[PDB]
Ligand binder design. Structure first.
Ligand SMILES: [Mg+2]
Ligand SMILES: [Mg+2]
Ligand SMILES: [Mg+2]
Ligand SMILES: [Mg+2]
Ligand SMILES: [Mg+2]
Ligand SMILES: [Mg+2]
Ligand SMILES: [Mg+2]
Ligand SMILES: [Mg+2]
Ligand SMILES: [Mg+2]
Ligand SMILES: [Mg+2]
Ligand SMILES: [Mg+2]
Ligand SMILES: [Mg+2]
Ligand SMILES: [Mg+2]
Ligand SMILES: [Mg+2]
Ligand SMILES: [Mg+2]
Length: 148
RNA sequence: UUGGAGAGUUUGAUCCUGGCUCAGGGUGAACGCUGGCGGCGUGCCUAAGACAUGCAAGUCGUGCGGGCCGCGGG
């Protein structure tokens, strides 16, 4: 079936009379390596539940992302509030050029060759959301002349 | 169209802002520890401070008159 990757685990904290009491946040992308990716954020009182909870939501938030010989059809920039991802198509023999967060998303979508660059807040979460919305806005020639 | 990776650190925790710091590459280098050979580079970045000694620009007797020495006789 699909394939999972844990980009982010982190411990948060709330306060009460007595001290700090913790939660856990799991940021996990799930892909098909052939054009299906999803991103999910799952928060739970212990690490396994969250890691498992996020993979659930991930499977219910997928994007088409239409590959073209392993690369995306056009350059794209998306801002998710102070976070900014740039994606540029790249020829075959180049590789996936991305930091760890967008890499896990592109590599699970079957992107084999792309140029990326994060800008502004490189906050992993918001960068991950902005990478997903970037893929969500990918158009093809058949997509655009149908629109026109 | 051959080209673009980020991370640590302000909070109990969050998002943002922002500075500091790090991973890379480079040097006519220097310093420490260590040191086998070969090739090709390359070596006063400071006092354009001061310098012993030798050498780094001479050559033509097919321009000219001469002193010397050596070779053939007058
Ligand atoms: Mg499409
Ligand atoms: Mg902005
Ligand atoms: Mg942001
Ligand atoms: Mg910043
Ligand atoms: Mg940061
Ligand atoms: Mg500190
Ligand atoms: Mg403060
Ligand atoms: Mg602290
Ligand atoms: Mg910073
Ligand atoms: Mg020897
Ligand atoms: Mg000098
Ligand atoms: Mg000197
Ligand atoms: Mg002086
Ligand atoms: Mg001489
Ligand atoms: Mg002479």
């Amino acid at each position: 079936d699909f394939e999972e990757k844990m980009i982010l685990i982190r411990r948060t904290a709330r306060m009460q009379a007595g001290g700090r009491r913790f939660r856990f946040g799991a940021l996990v992308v799930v892909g098909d390596r052939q054009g299906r990716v999803g991103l999910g954020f799952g928060k739970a009182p212990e690490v396994p539940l969250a890691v498992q909870k996020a993979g659930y939501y991930a499977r219910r938030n997928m994007v088409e992302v239409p590959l073209q010989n392993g690369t995306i059809p056009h350059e794209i920039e998306v801002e998710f509030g102070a976070s900014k991802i740039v994606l540029k198509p790249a020829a075959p023999g180049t590789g996936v050029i991305a930091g760890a967060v967008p890499r896990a998303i592109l590599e699970l979508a079957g992107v084999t060759d792309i140029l990326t660059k994060e800008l502004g807040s490189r906050n992993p979460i918001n960068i991950a959301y902005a990478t997903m919305e970037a893929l969500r806005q990918l158009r093809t020639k058949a997509d655009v002349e149908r629109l026109r």
